């Protein structure tokens, strides 16, 4: 399950979910969870319309 | 079709509008061509 | 009974099947000591020692996950179940 998450969130799409994992690997942080991908939230504002 | 209307709790009133939403600018990309002819989705053009 | 296994394989997943209820469970209740090991090495530095460090002595810059799974064979750590 969390390997399909990321691959169809935190690679992907989501922008910040992106950057922070980035710089969450350059640092020794833990790698923050995905967010919503851009896809759900585009569909969103679309069906709203 | 009445006792769905009854149960959602809402009002047919919805089947008629009276402001229709766009969405935002970038889901109907505006494109400039080497001449800059508007050749982007015809939404424009329904909108216009 | 077995010669003993050489890379990631080590230790074996029948062994620790015996100790966790299914296969499925067994990743999320490594997962977390991984995640704890981590947090616990990014402390360090300063902080509290909430999130003992490592129970079995680790080896020369092994990764935290193994060090999870090793220990989880040793029979070291309880969780609950579910909620």
Do not use: W
């Not at chain 1, 969390?2 to 020794?28: F, P």
């Amino acid at each position: 399950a969390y390997t399909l998450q990321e691959l169809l969130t935190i690679k992907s799409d989501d922008t910040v979910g992106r950057v922070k994992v980035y710089e969450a690997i350059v640092k020794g942080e833990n790698i923050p969870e995905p967010g919503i991908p851009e896809s759900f939230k585009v569909l969103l504002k679309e069906l709203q319309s | 079709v009445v006792a769905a209307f009854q149960q959602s709790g809402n009002s047919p009133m919805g089947m008629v509008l009276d402001a229709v939403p766009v969405i935002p600018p970038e889901l109907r990309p505006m494109v400039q061509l080497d001449g800059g002819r508007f050749a982007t989705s015809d939404l424009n053009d329904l909108y216009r | 009974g077995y010669d003993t296994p050489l890379g990631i394989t080590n230790p074996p997943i029948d062994e620790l099947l015996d100790r966790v209820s299914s296969k499925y469970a067994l990743v999320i209740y490594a997962a977390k000591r991984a995640r704890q090991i981590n947090d616990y090495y990014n402390q360090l530095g300063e902080g509290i020692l909430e999130y003992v460090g490592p129970l079995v002595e680790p080896g020369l810059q092994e990764k935290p996950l193994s060090i999870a799974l090793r220990e989880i064979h040793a029979d070291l750590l309880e969780h609950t179940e579910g909620e």
